[PDB]
Amino acid sequence: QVSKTSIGWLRLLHHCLTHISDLEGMMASAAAPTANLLQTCAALLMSPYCGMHSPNIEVVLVKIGLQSTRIGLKLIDILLRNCAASLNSPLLFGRLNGLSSDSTIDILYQLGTTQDPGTKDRIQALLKWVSDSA
Amino acid sequence: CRYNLACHRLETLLQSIDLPPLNSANNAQYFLRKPDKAVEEDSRVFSAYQDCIQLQLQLNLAHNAVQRLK
Structure with a gap:
């Protein structure tokens, strides 16, 4: 699968984020900025198994989304509102927008x-998605 | 009474039965390869449903025989 899919890059990113906890932050800071990274990681999360188990993809998504409030809000929007990329x-x-799985539920939870500075905003965003939905 | 018990069994088994919508690749794979737990749940549902249908047939036959006698 690593040869025929993009999953190898996600396994590398997961190793960078998780292998040495003390470096996680730095790695997340280096990974958050790249355009459409969260959309791609979500797409790989909701795709049939292609050489990477769901928990590791979830760990990558959570660690990126939690490294700053803006990215956390973007991840919430990707999971709930619009997961398409921002020839x-x-x-x-x-993929349909807002589809849920055990992985998406766990990530949102x-x-x-x-508990961190952005939690309120994240909750706010969540509640917004609720009200808008209603 | 027996058919009510069978219906309750089928009802309790079906209330835990969930059908993923065919709107994503993962659900499509679920339908392409039914997972083992899904297979066991379907076997139990088929058994309970067969019991319910047999008891329903017996109940309707008994009701029609009672109507013949009345």
């Missing part, structure tokens, strides 16, 4: 219930 540009048109 060479990434598209990620293939960790984003909401993780």
Whole structure:
């Protein structure tokens, strides 16, 4: 699968984020900025197994989304509102918006219930998605 | 009474039965390869449903025989 998919890059990113905890922050800071990274990681999360188990992808998504408030809000929007990428540009048109799995539920729960400066805003965003939905 | 018990069994087994919508690749794979637990749940559902249908047939036959006698 590593040869025929993009999963190898996600396994490398997971290793960078998780192998040495003391470096996680730095790695997350280096990984958050890249455009369409969260959309791509979500797409790989919701795709059939391609050489990377769901928990590791969830760990990557959570660690990126928690490294700053803006990215956390972007991840919430990707999971709930619009997961498409923000002829060479990434598209990620293939998946319906807002689809839920055990992985997405766990990621959203960790984003909401993780205590840090952005938690309020994240909760706020969550509640917004509720009201808008209603 | 027996058919009510069978219906309760089928009801309790079906209330835990969930059907993933065919709107994503993962659900499509679920339908392509039914997971083992899904297979066991379907076997139990089929057994309970067969019991319910047999008891329903017996109940309707008994009701029609009672109507013949009345």
